Design a protein around this nucleic acid. Sequence first.
DNA 1: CTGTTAGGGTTAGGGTTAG
DNA 2: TCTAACCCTAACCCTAACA
Lengths: 76, 77
Amino acid sequence: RRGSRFTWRKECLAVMESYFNENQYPDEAKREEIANACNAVIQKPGKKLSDLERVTSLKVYNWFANRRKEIKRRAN
Amino acid sequence: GSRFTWRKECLAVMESYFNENQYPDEAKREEIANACNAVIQKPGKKLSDLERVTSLKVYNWFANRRKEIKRRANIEA
DNA sequence: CTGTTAGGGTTAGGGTTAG
DNA sequence: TCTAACCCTAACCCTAACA
Ligand SMILES: [Cl-]
């Protein structure tokens, strides 16, 4: 975990939250869908997405999981 | 004041460890803390809870140090 | 028997607060 | 002002409860 830390861009979070309200438990395929969705919003024309910037299904997973946890905790 | 303040000697000690490893575990942090206290400890005087060094404080400092460094890096870039 | 993952933890980067 | 303590949460580990 000592590597530089990834940041979710405001535009990705929108897609995320959109998909999150619909359903908070995306399956693998769904996560891939959301991943491509997010990438499509951030990729700059004419440039490939760096491996550090590209959203993967796993990032999406962890995001959902973490959010669920934060909510459950923030409900006392 | 009424907030914890790092004594120079303590900082020196901690820095000596920071240059070797920047992520000391609990046990190591105990060692470091005890080292610090030993130095700032005066005879026949119990160190007040505030000025007393603990593994948690060491932890906080190490983290803050790493972060300060990462800032200093971006400043020069 | 093989394979997934919820949700209980922890570690640590980038930033903000509080005294 | 100065910075120790804290906040948030990305990214992982672990085991029970499944399919
Ligand atoms: Cl931290």
